[PDB]
Amino acid sequence: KPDILWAPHHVDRFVVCDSELSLYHVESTLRLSEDSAATLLSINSDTPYMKCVAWYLNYDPECLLAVGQANGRVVLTSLGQDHNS
Amino acid sequence: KPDILWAPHHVDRFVVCDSELSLYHVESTSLRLSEDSAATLLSINSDTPYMKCVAWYLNYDPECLLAVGQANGRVVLTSLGQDHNS
Secondary structure (H helix, E strand, C coil), rough: CCCCCCCCCCCCCCEECCCCCCEEEEECCCCCCCCEEEEEEEEEECCCCCCEEEECCCCCCCEEEEEECCCCCEEEECCCCCCCC | CCEEEEECCCEEEEEEEECCCCEEEEEEEEEEEEEEEEEEEEEEEEECCCCEEEEECCCCCCCEEEEECCCCCCCEEEEECCCCCC
């Protein structure tokens, strides 16, 4: 069941949940809308065949979305290129 | 068989290959490679679990691209840098 998640602190951050996860940031004008353009930020497939999706309430660290495996092995990855999140 | 690789155009880029690929940039002095050197991770990705083979591009454009070839035989060309104008 694919779904799109929005950042808790950013209303212009777009996400997608599929076999290879991808993230995009909304920029005014892919062509999301007539006056909107979609530009991807980071696409990673570190958790193939996703099981459960969760998000963190805390502002930091950013790009905090939870990824779990079919065997119950959860992966906690941050999409933003943060050397010191 | 994990192996350590470096970028063909950048010398400050260091990579360690595993089930979860780690890309780091060398900065003067985070991983402390030497006494006066620190390496900061650029991104973390594990798009190729239980991988067997990998390679790298022969052109500066695009950069930060390495092969992701799993045991199933599928060849995945994934780029780890902040890809915007490939």
